[PDB]
Short mmCIF file of N, CA and C in Angstrom, two decimals:
data_model
loop_
_atom_site.label_atom_id
_atom_site.label_comp_id
_atom_site.label_asym_id
_atom_site.label_seq_id
_atom_site.Cartn_x
_atom_site.Cartn_y
_atom_site.Cartn_z
N UNK Q 10 0.72 -1.33 0.03
CA UNK Q 10 0.02 -0.03 0.01
C UNK Q 10 0.72 1.37 0.04
N UNK Q 11 2.01 1.46 0.56
CA UNK Q 11 2.75 2.61 0.75
C UNK Q 11 3.98 2.42 1.68
N UNK Q 12 5.12 3.18 1.46
CA UNK Q 12 6.28 3.16 2.33
C UNK Q 12 7.63 3.84 1.88
N UNK Q 13 8.37 3.99 2.79
CA UNK Q 13 9.78 4.64 2.48
C UNK Q 13 10.64 3.74 1.57
N UNK Q 14 11.58 4.39 0.97
CA UNK Q 14 12.59 3.65 0.13
C UNK Q 14 13.91 4.01 0.81
N UNK Q 15 14.70 2.96 0.97
CA UNK Q 15 16.13 3.18 1.46
C UNK Q 15 16.84 4.16 0.44
N UNK Q 16 17.70 5.04 1.10
CA UNK Q 16 18.92 5.60 0.56
C UNK Q 16 20.25 4.96 1.10
N UNK Q 54 -8.66 16.61 10.28
CA UNK Q 54 -8.77 17.26 9.01
C UNK Q 54 -7.32 17.51 8.45
N UNK Q 55 -7.21 17.56 7.23
CA UNK Q 55 -5.89 17.74 6.50
C UNK Q 55 -5.86 19.02 5.64
N UNK Q 56 -6.83 19.92 5.65
CA UNK Q 56 -7.05 20.91 4.62
C UNK Q 56 -6.02 22.07 4.72
N UNK Q 57 -5.10 22.04 5.75
CA UNK Q 57 -3.89 22.95 5.86
C UNK Q 57 -2.67 22.09 5.78
N UNK Q 58 -2.87 20.77 5.61
CA UNK Q 58 -1.72 19.83 5.73
C UNK Q 58 -0.53 20.22 4.83
N UNK Q 59 -0.78 20.60 3.64
CA UNK Q 59 0.18 20.86 2.69
C UNK Q 59 0.09 22.40 2.41
N UNK Q 60 -0.42 23.23 3.25
CA UNK Q 60 -0.33 24.63 2.99
C UNK Q 60 1.12 24.99 3.00
N UNK Q 61 1.48 25.91 2.05
CA UNK Q 61 2.80 26.42 1.96
C UNK Q 61 3.51 25.66 0.90
N UNK Q 62 2.89 24.51 0.41
CA UNK Q 62 3.75 23.52 -0.42
C UNK Q 62 3.46 23.83 -1.84
N UNK Q 63 4.47 23.44 -2.64
CA UNK Q 63 4.43 23.48 -4.18
C UNK Q 63 4.49 21.87 -4.50
N UNK Q 64 3.52 21.45 -5.31
CA UNK Q 64 3.65 19.99 -5.71
C UNK Q 64 3.67 19.75 -7.20
N UNK Q 65 4.50 18.80 -7.71
CA UNK Q 65 4.25 18.46 -9.19
C UNK Q 65 3.67 17.08 -9.03
N UNK Q 66 2.65 16.83 -9.84
CA UNK Q 66 1.95 15.58 -10.16
C UNK Q 66 2.33 15.18 -11.63
N UNK Q 67 2.97 13.98 -11.62
CA UNK Q 67 3.32 13.41 -12.97
C UNK Q 67 2.57 12.10 -13.20
N UNK Q 68 1.75 12.04 -14.21
CA UNK Q 68 0.87 10.97 -14.51
C UNK Q 68 0.43 11.01 -15.93
N UNK Q 69 0.64 10.01 -16.66
CA UNK Q 69 0.20 9.92 -18.05
C UNK Q 69 -1.36 9.86 -18.31
N UNK Q 70 -2.12 9.65 -17.27
CA UNK Q 70 -3.52 9.42 -17.46
C UNK Q 70 -4.26 10.63 -16.97
N UNK Q 71 -5.05 11.04 -17.83
CA UNK Q 71 -5.63 12.37 -17.62
C UNK Q 71 -6.61 12.36 -16.37
N UNK Q 72 -7.27 11.26 -16.20
CA UNK Q 72 -8.27 11.21 -15.10
C UNK Q 72 -7.45 11.10 -13.69
N UNK Q 73 -6.62 10.04 -13.55
CA UNK Q 73 -5.68 9.87 -12.35
C UNK Q 73 -5.11 11.24 -12.06
N UNK Q 74 -4.58 11.90 -13.08
CA UNK Q 74 -3.89 13.23 -12.74
C UNK Q 74 -4.82 14.25 -12.15
N UNK Q 75 -6.04 14.38 -12.63
CA UNK Q 75 -7.00 15.37 -12.01
C UNK Q 75 -7.40 15.00 -10.66
N UNK Q 76 -7.40 13.79 -10.40
CA UNK Q 76 -7.82 13.23 -9.07
C UNK Q 76 -6.66 13.61 -8.10
N UNK Q 77 -5.55 13.29 -8.53
CA UNK Q 77 -4.40 13.64 -7.75
C UNK Q 77 -4.43 15.13 -7.34
N UNK Q 78 -4.46 16.02 -8.38
CA UNK Q 78 -4.32 17.42 -8.21
C UNK Q 78 -5.46 17.80 -7.13
N UNK Q 79 -6.61 17.27 -7.46
CA UNK Q 79 -7.80 17.64 -6.54
C UNK Q 79 -7.69 17.28 -5.10
N UNK Q 80 -7.07 16.14 -4.88
CA UNK Q 80 -6.86 15.61 -3.57
C UNK Q 80 -5.73 16.52 -2.85
N UNK Q 81 -4.82 17.09 -3.59
CA UNK Q 81 -3.80 17.91 -3.14
C UNK Q 81 -4.33 19.35 -2.70
N UNK Q 82 -5.26 19.70 -3.73
CA UNK Q 82 -5.87 21.02 -3.37
C UNK Q 82 -6.65 21.07 -2.11
N UNK Q 83 -7.32 19.98 -1.88
CA UNK Q 83 -8.10 19.81 -0.62
C UNK Q 83 -7.25 19.78 0.53
N UNK Q 84 -5.95 19.41 0.45
CA UNK Q 84 -4.98 19.51 1.49
C UNK Q 84 -4.47 20.85 1.68
N UNK Q 85 -4.78 21.81 0.90
CA UNK Q 85 -4.32 23.12 1.11
C UNK Q 85 -3.11 23.45 0.36
N UNK Q 86 -2.80 22.80 -0.68
CA UNK Q 86 -1.43 22.89 -1.45
C UNK Q 86 -1.38 24.28 -2.01
N UNK Q 87 -0.31 25.07 -1.85
CA UNK Q 87 -0.28 26.38 -2.37
C UNK Q 87 -0.19 26.31 -3.95
N UNK Q 88 0.66 25.59 -4.56
CA UNK Q 88 0.67 25.42 -5.97
C UNK Q 88 0.73 23.94 -6.42
N UNK Q 89 -0.09 23.43 -7.32
CA UNK Q 89 0.03 22.10 -7.82
C UNK Q 89 0.31 22.33 -9.28
N UNK Q 90 1.28 21.66 -9.78
CA UNK Q 90 1.68 21.65 -11.15
C UNK Q 90 1.46 20.19 -11.63
N UNK Q 91 1.11 20.01 -12.89
CA UNK Q 91 0.67 18.71 -13.24
C UNK Q 91 1.49 18.53 -14.73
N UNK Q 92 1.90 17.38 -14.95
CA UNK Q 92 2.37 17.08 -16.27
C UNK Q 92 2.13 15.60 -16.70
N UNK Q 93 2.20 15.34 -18.01
CA UNK Q 93 1.76 14.05 -18.44
C UNK Q 93 2.81 13.04 -18.88
N UNK Q 94 4.06 13.41 -18.54
CA UNK Q 94 5.11 12.48 -18.96
C UNK Q 94 6.34 12.74 -18.16
N UNK Q 95 7.13 11.64 -18.10
CA UNK Q 95 8.46 11.75 -17.48
C UNK Q 95 9.30 12.87 -18.05
N UNK Q 96 9.24 12.98 -19.41
CA UNK Q 96 10.14 13.97 -19.97
C UNK Q 96 9.58 15.40 -19.70
N UNK Q 97 8.35 15.61 -19.53
CA UNK Q 97 7.87 16.89 -19.12
C UNK Q 97 8.29 17.23 -17.74
N UNK Q 98 8.27 16.26 -16.85
CA UNK Q 98 8.57 16.41 -15.48
C UNK Q 98 10.03 16.83 -15.39
N UNK Q 99 10.86 16.13 -16.21
CA UNK Q 99 12.30 16.36 -16.16
C UNK Q 99 12.57 17.86 -16.73
N UNK Q 100 11.81 18.25 -17.73
CA UNK Q 100 11.87 19.68 -18.13
C UNK Q 100 11.50 20.69 -17.05
N UNK Q 101 10.32 20.39 -16.44
CA UNK Q 101 9.89 21.40 -15.48
C UNK Q 101 10.82 21.48 -14.30
N UNK Q 102 11.35 20.39 -13.88
CA UNK Q 102 12.24 20.46 -12.72
C UNK Q 102 13.57 20.97 -13.16
N UNK Q 103 14.04 20.82 -14.42
CA UNK Q 103 15.29 21.33 -14.89
C UNK Q 103 15.27 22.80 -14.97
N UNK Q 104 14.21 23.40 -15.51
CA UNK Q 104 14.01 24.72 -15.74
C UNK Q 104 13.81 25.44 -14.39
N UNK Q 105 12.93 24.83 -13.54
CA UNK Q 105 12.75 25.31 -12.18
C UNK Q 105 13.99 25.43 -11.33
N UNK Q 106 14.80 24.46 -11.31
CA UNK Q 106 16.10 24.67 -10.65
C UNK Q 106 16.96 25.65 -11.08
N UNK Q 107 17.18 25.76 -12.38
CA UNK Q 107 17.84 26.92 -13.00
C UNK Q 107 17.35 28.30 -12.63
N UNK Q 108 16.09 28.41 -12.83
CA UNK Q 108 15.36 29.65 -12.53
C UNK Q 108 15.65 30.06 -11.22
N UNK Q 109 15.53 29.10 -10.19
CA UNK Q 109 15.71 29.53 -8.85
C UNK Q 109 17.05 29.90 -8.35
N UNK Q 110 18.05 29.23 -8.96
CA UNK Q 110 19.46 29.36 -8.83
C UNK Q 110 19.69 30.83 -9.48
N UNK Q 111 19.23 31.15 -10.64
CA UNK Q 111 19.62 32.42 -11.26
C UNK Q 111 19.06 33.53 -10.48
N UNK Q 112 17.83 33.40 -9.98
CA UNK Q 112 17.17 34.54 -9.10
C UNK Q 112 17.64 34.59 -7.67
N UNK Q 113 18.43 33.67 -7.28
CA UNK Q 113 18.83 33.51 -5.80
C UNK Q 113 17.69 33.21 -4.96
N UNK Q 114 16.64 32.49 -5.38
CA UNK Q 114 15.41 32.24 -4.58
C UNK Q 114 15.77 31.72 -3.35
N UNK Q 115 14.92 32.14 -2.32
CA UNK Q 115 14.91 31.49 -0.83
C UNK Q 115 14.82 29.91 -1.03
N UNK Q 116 13.65 29.52 -1.62
CA UNK Q 116 13.48 28.11 -1.98
C UNK Q 116 14.12 27.82 -3.32
N UNK Q 117 15.21 26.87 -3.26
CA UNK Q 117 15.85 26.37 -4.56
C UNK Q 117 15.16 25.22 -5.25
N UNK Q 118 14.25 24.55 -4.50
CA UNK Q 118 13.50 23.53 -5.16
C UNK Q 118 12.33 24.14 -5.83
N UNK Q 119 12.02 23.76 -7.12
CA UNK Q 119 10.91 24.28 -7.61
C UNK Q 119 9.68 23.60 -7.11
N UNK Q 120 9.78 22.41 -6.57
CA UNK Q 120 8.66 21.65 -6.06
C UNK Q 120 9.09 21.10 -4.70
N UNK Q 121 8.30 21.07 -3.66
CA UNK Q 121 8.62 20.45 -2.39
C UNK Q 121 8.34 19.00 -2.45
N UNK Q 122 7.53 18.52 -3.32
CA UNK Q 122 7.25 17.06 -3.46
C UNK Q 122 6.88 16.87 -4.85
N UNK Q 123 7.26 15.76 -5.39
CA UNK Q 123 6.96 15.33 -6.71
C UNK Q 123 6.27 13.95 -6.68
N UNK Q 124 5.09 13.70 -7.23
CA UNK Q 124 4.52 12.50 -7.20
C UNK Q 124 4.60 12.00 -8.61
N UNK Q 125 5.20 10.88 -8.73
CA UNK Q 125 5.78 10.31 -9.96
C UNK Q 125 5.24 8.92 -10.32
N UNK Q 126 4.36 9.02 -11.33
CA UNK Q 126 3.81 7.78 -11.96
C UNK Q 126 5.05 6.72 -12.38
N UNK Q 127 5.05 5.58 -11.87
CA UNK Q 127 6.12 4.66 -12.23
C UNK Q 127 6.03 4.25 -13.70
N UNK Q 128 4.89 3.78 -14.15
CA UNK Q 128 4.83 3.20 -15.50
C UNK Q 128 4.19 4.12 -16.38
N UNK Q 129 5.02 4.61 -17.31
CA UNK Q 129 4.54 5.56 -18.31
C UNK Q 129 5.21 5.19 -19.44
N UNK Q 130 4.62 5.57 -20.68
CA UNK Q 130 5.33 5.26 -21.93
C UNK Q 130 6.51 6.08 -22.13
N UNK Q 131 7.43 5.78 -22.90
CA UNK Q 131 8.62 6.58 -23.32
C UNK Q 131 9.52 6.67 -22.00
N UNK Q 132 9.71 7.76 -21.35
CA UNK Q 132 10.45 7.81 -20.14
C UNK Q 132 9.53 7.57 -18.92
N UNK Q 133 9.76 6.44 -18.39
CA UNK Q 133 8.94 6.05 -17.29
C UNK Q 133 9.40 6.81 -15.86
N UNK Q 134 8.76 6.64 -14.87
CA UNK Q 134 9.05 7.42 -13.66
C UNK Q 134 10.35 7.08 -12.98
N UNK Q 135 10.88 5.80 -13.18
CA UNK Q 135 12.19 5.51 -12.65
C UNK Q 135 13.20 6.23 -13.36
N UNK Q 136 13.13 6.24 -14.83
CA UNK Q 136 14.22 6.90 -15.57
C UNK Q 136 14.00 8.48 -15.38
N UNK Q 137 12.97 8.91 -15.29
CA UNK Q 137 12.77 10.39 -14.98
C UNK Q 137 13.31 10.82 -13.66
N UNK Q 138 13.13 9.97 -12.70
CA UNK Q 138 13.68 10.27 -11.37
C UNK Q 138 15.17 10.19 -11.40
N UNK Q 139 15.72 9.11 -12.12
CA UNK Q 139 17.13 9.11 -12.30
C UNK Q 139 17.68 10.35 -12.85
N UNK Q 140 17.06 10.93 -13.93
CA UNK Q 140 17.62 12.08 -14.59
C UNK Q 140 17.40 13.26 -13.74
N UNK Q 141 16.31 13.38 -13.00
CA UNK Q 141 16.17 14.47 -12.07
C UNK Q 141 17.30 14.40 -11.07
N UNK Q 142 17.63 13.30 -10.39
CA UNK Q 142 18.68 13.21 -9.54
C UNK Q 142 19.91 13.68 -10.10
N UNK Q 143 20.22 13.47 -11.34
CA UNK Q 143 21.47 13.82 -12.00
C UNK Q 143 21.35 15.43 -12.21
N UNK Q 144 20.33 15.89 -12.63
CA UNK Q 144 20.16 17.42 -12.81
C UNK Q 144 20.44 18.04 -11.35
N UNK Q 145 19.88 17.49 -10.35
CA UNK Q 145 19.97 18.14 -8.87
C UNK Q 145 21.37 18.15 -8.42
N UNK Q 146 22.24 17.26 -8.81
CA UNK Q 146 23.64 16.97 -8.22
C UNK Q 146 24.33 18.39 -8.16
N UNK Q 147 24.20 18.99 -9.26
CA UNK Q 147 24.75 20.28 -9.54
C UNK Q 147 24.32 21.39 -8.59
N UNK Q 148 23.14 21.21 -7.96
CA UNK Q 148 22.58 22.27 -7.13
C UNK Q 148 22.82 21.80 -5.63
N UNK Q 149 23.20 20.61 -5.38
CA UNK Q 149 23.26 20.17 -3.99
C UNK Q 149 21.89 20.00 -3.24
N UNK Q 150 20.84 19.88 -4.10
CA UNK Q 150 19.44 19.68 -3.39
C UNK Q 150 18.97 18.36 -3.72
N UNK Q 151 17.82 17.90 -3.25
CA UNK Q 151 17.19 16.52 -3.45
C UNK Q 151 15.67 16.78 -3.19
N UNK Q 152 14.96 16.70 -4.27
CA UNK Q 152 13.44 16.75 -4.15
C UNK Q 152 12.95 15.48 -3.74
N UNK Q 153 12.14 15.44 -2.69
CA UNK Q 153 11.36 14.37 -2.16
C UNK Q 153 10.48 13.73 -3.47
N UNK Q 154 10.70 12.62 -4.01
CA UNK Q 154 10.05 12.16 -5.17
C UNK Q 154 9.41 10.80 -4.60
N UNK Q 155 8.02 10.71 -4.81
CA UNK Q 155 7.24 9.57 -4.34
C UNK Q 155 6.74 8.79 -5.46
N UNK Q 156 7.09 7.62 -5.56
CA UNK Q 156 6.68 6.67 -6.74
C UNK Q 156 5.19 6.35 -6.62
N UNK Q 157 4.35 6.53 -7.65
CA UNK Q 157 3.01 6.27 -7.56
C UNK Q 157 2.81 5.04 -8.51
N UNK Q 158 2.07 4.02 -8.21
CA UNK Q 158 1.97 2.74 -8.65
C UNK Q 158 0.53 2.21 -8.34
N UNK Q 159 -0.05 1.47 -9.32
CA UNK Q 159 -1.29 0.74 -9.22
C UNK Q 159 -1.10 -0.60 -8.43
N UNK Q 160 0.09 -1.14 -8.26
CA UNK Q 160 0.28 -2.37 -7.48
C UNK Q 160 1.60 -2.23 -6.65
N UNK Q 161 1.75 -3.21 -5.87
CA UNK Q 161 2.93 -3.44 -4.88
C UNK Q 161 4.00 -3.71 -5.88
N UNK Q 162 5.20 -3.06 -5.59
CA UNK Q 162 6.39 -3.46 -6.52
C UNK Q 162 6.79 -4.83 -6.34
N UNK Q 163 7.18 -5.39 -7.44
CA UNK Q 163 7.99 -6.61 -7.41
C UNK Q 163 9.49 -6.43 -7.17
N UNK Q 164 10.24 -7.53 -7.32
CA UNK Q 164 11.70 -7.45 -7.13
C UNK Q 164 12.34 -6.37 -8.00
N UNK Q 165 12.15 -6.52 -9.27
CA UNK Q 165 12.74 -5.62 -10.31
C UNK Q 165 12.30 -4.15 -10.12
N UNK Q 166 10.95 -4.00 -9.80
CA UNK Q 166 10.45 -2.57 -9.70
C UNK Q 166 11.06 -1.95 -8.41
N UNK Q 167 11.29 -2.79 -7.43
CA UNK Q 167 11.58 -2.35 -6.11
C UNK Q 167 13.16 -1.93 -6.25
N UNK Q 168 13.89 -2.78 -7.11
CA UNK Q 168 15.19 -2.56 -7.29
C UNK Q 168 15.44 -1.09 -8.06
N UNK Q 169 14.60 -1.04 -9.07
CA UNK Q 169 14.60 0.37 -9.96
C UNK Q 169 14.15 1.51 -8.99
N UNK Q 170 13.13 1.29 -8.12
CA UNK Q 170 12.81 2.33 -7.14
C UNK Q 170 14.05 2.81 -6.26
N UNK Q 171 14.94 1.91 -5.85
CA UNK Q 171 16.07 2.31 -5.12
C UNK Q 171 17.17 2.87 -6.02
N UNK Q 172 17.39 2.28 -7.21
CA UNK Q 172 18.47 2.84 -7.98
C UNK Q 172 18.05 4.25 -8.57
N UNK Q 173 16.77 4.28 -8.80
CA UNK Q 173 16.31 5.64 -9.32
C UNK Q 173 16.60 6.70 -8.37
N UNK Q 174 16.45 6.48 -7.07
CA UNK Q 174 16.52 7.47 -6.03
C UNK Q 174 15.26 7.99 -5.54
N UNK Q 175 14.18 7.31 -5.60
CA UNK Q 175 12.87 7.59 -5.05
C UNK Q 175 13.07 7.54 -3.54
N UNK Q 176 12.21 8.45 -2.91
CA UNK Q 176 12.08 8.52 -1.42
C UNK Q 176 11.13 7.66 -0.94
N UNK Q 177 10.04 7.32 -1.60
CA UNK Q 177 8.90 6.70 -0.96
C UNK Q 177 7.91 6.14 -2.07
N UNK Q 178 7.02 5.32 -1.83
CA UNK Q 178 6.09 4.74 -2.73
C UNK Q 178 4.68 4.83 -2.11
N UNK Q 179 3.64 4.92 -3.00
CA UNK Q 179 2.28 5.29 -2.65
C UNK Q 179 1.44 4.45 -3.70
N UNK Q 180 0.39 3.84 -3.29
CA UNK Q 180 -0.58 3.22 -4.32
C UNK Q 180 -1.35 4.45 -4.83
N UNK Q 181 -1.95 4.11 -5.98
CA UNK Q 181 -2.49 5.40 -6.70
C UNK Q 181 -3.74 5.87 -6.18
N UNK Q 182 -4.41 5.37 -5.17
CA UNK Q 182 -5.36 5.98 -4.38
C UNK Q 182 -4.82 7.16 -3.69
N UNK Q 183 -3.63 7.16 -3.29
CA UNK Q 183 -2.95 8.17 -2.50
C UNK Q 183 -3.57 8.27 -0.97
N UNK Q 184 -4.14 7.30 -0.56
CA UNK Q 184 -4.59 7.28 0.78
C UNK Q 184 -3.64 7.68 1.89
N UNK Q 185 -2.52 6.97 1.78
CA UNK Q 185 -1.38 7.18 2.83
C UNK Q 185 -0.59 8.43 2.43
N UNK Q 186 -0.99 9.35 1.73
CA UNK Q 186 -0.13 10.41 1.20
C UNK Q 186 0.30 11.25 2.36
N UNK Q 187 -0.62 11.67 3.27
CA UNK Q 187 -0.16 12.42 4.46
C UNK Q 187 0.82 11.73 5.34
N UNK Q 188 0.46 10.48 5.65
CA UNK Q 188 1.35 9.64 6.32
C UNK Q 188 2.82 9.64 5.69
N UNK Q 189 2.87 9.29 4.48
CA UNK Q 189 4.15 9.06 3.73
C UNK Q 189 4.87 10.37 3.86
N UNK Q 190 4.18 11.50 3.58
CA UNK Q 190 4.89 12.82 3.57
C UNK Q 190 5.45 13.17 5.13
N UNK Q 191 4.76 12.85 6.11
CA UNK Q 191 5.26 12.90 7.52
C UNK Q 191 6.46 11.99 7.79
N UNK Q 192 6.39 10.79 7.19
CA UNK Q 192 7.58 9.88 7.23
C UNK Q 192 8.69 10.63 6.68
N UNK Q 193 8.55 11.12 5.39
CA UNK Q 193 9.64 11.69 4.76
C UNK Q 193 10.16 12.88 5.60
N UNK Q 194 9.29 13.58 6.17
CA UNK Q 194 9.75 14.81 6.92
C UNK Q 194 10.53 14.56 8.28
N UNK Q 195 10.28 13.40 8.94
CA UNK Q 195 11.14 12.97 9.98
C UNK Q 195 12.68 12.72 9.35
N UNK Q 196 12.73 11.89 8.46
CA UNK Q 196 13.91 11.77 7.74
C UNK Q 196 14.29 13.09 7.17
#
């Protein structure tokens, strides 16, 4: 159902910027709606691993160039694991490589319709995801509090 990966709630994410990455238009609106109801300050949504990598790449650059107080363009990224073309593992890997250069690490939570198997669990770690969540997102608040202890 949900958990960490080794290396009322309506103000729960107030102050937060989130990116939702999901190839499925309906899933995607549901995710962003759920996040809005938790008081999220900005939700950004995109439909592909490549778009996500773009938005994070440009966001990091922009914040660096402006000397922004917050250097992360998103406090959390929810990343669909299985997507055509660049899946969420590969996107996460590329995000981690883009971030190296800034000395930052965005919390990236893998979203999946099923519990990972061996090989997906292995990809989850190698990619550098922080946590995993089933696509209902029921445990989203939980998982985000876990990440914040860490």
